[PDB]
Design a protein around this ligand. Structure first.
Ligand SMILES: [Cl-]
Ligand SMILES: [Cl-]
Ligand SMILES: [Cl-]
Ligand SMILES: [Cl-]
Ligand SMILES: [Cl-]
Ligand code: NA
Ligand SMILES: [Pt+2]
Length: 129
């Protein structure tokens, strides 16, 4: 599914991401924009042979199992394919664990380089939340 920007904000809100660990909704929308362009089916291979999956590009090195990332963990206890569903529940639950883990949203490289410190409220402007 390719979410619309306000559509995604709504789903994230409903799933309790708005202000989760102190990160406002626009942070999560901005991260999603630059990680996946709001596409739940997005996949991208990392240099190390791990892969990032879904709307928030959750990477199999630590968080989900794809069966092809040697030495990796599956700290969200999910198949990585669950992170590609049209339903974002699994991605949001796993993102909550990621962002609780000590480095906050800096775990998302595109957040750090493209969202952090910017006017992220722009991402939820005009949405009916
Ligand atoms: Cl915001
Ligand atoms: Cl693996
Ligand atoms: Cl699995
Ligand atoms: Cl959803
Ligand atoms: Cl933080
Ligand atoms: Na893994
Ligand atoms: Pt939920």
């Amino acid at each position: 599914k390719v979410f619309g920007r306000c559509e995604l904000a709504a789903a994230m809100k409903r799933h309790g991401l708005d202000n989760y660990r102190g990160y406002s909704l626009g942070n999560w929308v901005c991260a999603a924009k630059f990680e996946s362009n709001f596409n739940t089916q997005a996949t991208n291979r990392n240099t190390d042979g791990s892969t990032d999956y879904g709307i928030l590009q959750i990477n199999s090195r630590w968080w989900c199992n794809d069966g092809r990332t040697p030495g990796s963990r599956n700290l969200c206890n999910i198949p990585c394919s669950a992170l590609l569903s049209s339903d974002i529940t699994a991605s949001v639950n796993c993102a909550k664990k990621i962002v609780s883990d000590g480095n906050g949203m800096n775990a998302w490289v595109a957040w750090r380089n493209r969202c952090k410190g910017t006017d992220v409220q722009a991402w939820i402007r005009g949405c009916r939340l």
